[PDB]
């Protein structure tokens, strides 16, 4: 894959948008399978 | 110079006999805009899909596997959408197409012919001459099967008869 295109995807706004979309996405998935967790179950 | 295929059309200029199967037919000038390596990769990929599809029809009327129900190939598409084997085929094709994405990057980076996957298990290609004739035959068959594909699917829609049974009747 082109190294200048990979250097473009390594730029701060793309990584910030991708990482926080990935981060938001597994919070969303964790609340789909395991909803309404007000407390650590113990 | 003039196009070999269309005498009155000028040659495209990105089609200078570099690829085998080149008859200068490119009126829309997609090769003046787009990379011809990408276009040839797609040509051979679409054509190989079409060739497997036309054979796919013909064999599927003649025979079907005992564990699967007998039915027409378009009905097979819908049955295997809802049964699960369609997603199987889609997954494994997509899996191979991942390494195809790597292959197309290798082609763009200059290190591979557009449809070459080094797939010669039976050693049918012997030397340069027979390989050039084989790939000319492959291109011609690939284009012809793409045409053929449209006919079998569209004709089944218009008249609900299979390709072999449609030759048999009418």
């Amino acid at each position: 894959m082109d190294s200048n295109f990979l250097k473009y995807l390594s730029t701060a706004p793309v990584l910030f948008t991708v990482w926080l979309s990935f981060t938001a996405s597994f919070i969303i998935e964790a609340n789909r399978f395991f909803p309404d967790m007000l407390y650590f179950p113990m | 110079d003039f196009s070999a295929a269309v005498p009155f059309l000028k040659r495209p200029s990105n089609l200078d006999g570099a690829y085998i199967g080149d008859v200068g037919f490119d009126p829309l000038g997609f090769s003046d805009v787009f990379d011809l390596r990408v276009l040839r990769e797609a040509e051979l990929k679409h054509g190989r899909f079409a060739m497997l599809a036309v054979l796919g029809f013909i064999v599927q009327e003649l025979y079907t596997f005992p564990f699967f129900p007998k039915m027409a190939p378009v009905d097979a598409h819908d049955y295997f959408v809802k049964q699960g084997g369609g997603s199987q085929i889609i997954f494994w094709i997509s899996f191979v197409e991942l390494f195809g994405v790597v292959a197309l990057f290798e082609t763009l980076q200059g290190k591979r012919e557009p449809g070459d996957f080094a797939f010669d298990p039976l050693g049918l290609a012997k030397d340069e001459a027979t390989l050039e004739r084989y790939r000319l035959a492959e291109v011609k068959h690939a284009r012809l099967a793409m045409i053929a594909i449209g006919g079998f699917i569209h004709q089944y829609w218009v008249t609900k008869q299979t390709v072999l049974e449609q030759l048999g009747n009418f």
Binding site: K7, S10, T11, A12, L15, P35, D36, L38, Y39, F40, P41, M42 | -
Partner: protein
């Protein structure tokens, strides 16, 4: 119970919360036919609402007079799953993010163009750092005691006053 609160499993106001929440959904369901997509959507919401109320009742949460769960955060161990353990989980992630971010800024200082490493991140090296964060409490304390976390006051620029 604690602070005059009632366990949610025997709170009558918690019981009325669950019932009112389901009556509100059932009257929306009364306007749809059985197999419709709006009926299945609301029937799945009545199942989810009941499940949540059942789980809260059996969890050891304490309800108020208002029938809502209340959190006890004074440090007692019977209630550590409401703040202390979520907090321990948070600080592990937070220190991980901090240790990993700190490790990359120190790497980028030794670069050919240090400010280009911060707008164009060296993703293989930055991923090398993110994996290291799992033992940040040991790595950061050893960093502290080995004199590499804290810089002395006389290498820090301050205002004249």
């Amino acid at each position: 119970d604690v602070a005059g609160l009632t366990p949610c499993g025997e709170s009558k106001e918690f019981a009325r919360r669950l019932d009112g929440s389901v009556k509100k959904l059932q009257t929306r369901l009364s306007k749809y036919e059985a197999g419709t997509p709006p009926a299945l959507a609301l029937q799945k919401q009545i199942d989810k609402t009941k499940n949540r109320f059942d789980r809260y009742g059996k969890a050891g949460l304490l309800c108020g007079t208002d029938g809502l769960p209340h959190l006890i955060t004074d440090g007692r161990w019977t209630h550590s799953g409401e703040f202390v353990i979520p907090g321990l989980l948070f600080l592990y992630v937070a220190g991980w993010i901090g240790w990993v971010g700190r490790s990359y800024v120190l790497f980028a200082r030794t670069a050919d163009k240090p400010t280009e490493k911060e707008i164009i991140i060296d993703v293989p090296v930055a991923l090398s750092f993110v994996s290291t964060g799992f033992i940040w409490p040991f790595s950061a304390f050893k960093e502290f005691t080995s004199g590499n976390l804290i810089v002395p006051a006389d290498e820090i620029t301050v205002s004249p006053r």
